[PDB]
Amino acid sequence: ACPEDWGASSRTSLCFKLYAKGKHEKKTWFESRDFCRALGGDLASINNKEEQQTIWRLITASGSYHKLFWLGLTYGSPSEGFTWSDGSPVSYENWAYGEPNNYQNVEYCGELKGDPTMSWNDINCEHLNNWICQI
Ligand SMILES: C[C@@H]1O[C@@H](O[C@H]2[C@H](O[C@H]3[C@H](O)[C@@H](O)[C@H](O)O[C@@H]3CO)O[C@H](CO)[C@H](O)[C@@H]2O)[C@@H](O)[C@H](O)[C@@H]1O
Ligand SMILES: [Ca+2]
């Protein structure tokens, strides 16, 4: 069962929470990771299409579209490439077309574009974004 306002009560329920913020309250990737971990969780990992649908449904209920959200995507070693901050394997992927492109060699964190494509992009970790936690 999920904590109240993080999802449903069944044993198979996945628990995510959107944090959409104004520009003065958006966070870097590391700040967002630390925020979610302080609650006992982590930045959201998306391990399959079921989790993607869960998050998309939350976005549709939010009324806002096109927002950028930090996910738990962070580059590891050169051989690893992208990893999930929660330690789960990066099996499922939904990178946008051409991504990750490490544009100008400075993009080591992953963001979700909150539109129907639910696509991922690598971007400067120091950008201030919205974020999504999991527990
Ligand atoms: C593809 C992109 O390349 C770099 O970002 C460029 C930026 O791309 C926008 C794109 O125009 C927009 O349609 C899409 O929704 O978001 C992208 C940003 O994530 O466009 C500006 C000009 O407006 C610059 O050309 C940027 O270089 C790269 O930084 C992004 O990570 C991404 O791979
Ligand atoms: Ca990119």
Swiss-Prot record:
Disulfide bonds: C2-C15, C36-C133, C109-C125
Cell compartments where the protein resides: Endosome membrane; Cell membrane
Domain C-type lectin as annotated: residue spans: 11-134
Superkingdom of source: Eukaryota
Record comment regarding domains: The C-type lectin domains, also called carbohydrate-recognition domains or CRDs, 1-3 have at most very weak affinity for carbohydrates. C-type lectin domain 4 shows the highest affinity binding and has multispecificity for a variety of monosaccharides. At least 3 C-type lectin domains (4, 5, and 7) are required for high affinity binding and endocytosis of multivalent glycoconjugates.
Record function comment: Mediates the endocytosis of glycoproteins by macrophages. Binds both sulfated and non-sulfated polysaccharide chains.
Subunit structure comment from the entry: (Microbial infection) Interacts with Dengue virus. (Microbial infection) May act as a receptor for hepatitis B virus, enabling uptake of the virus in hepatic dendritic cells.
Protein name: Macrophage mannose receptor 1
Organism field: Homo sapiens (Human)
Gene: MRC1
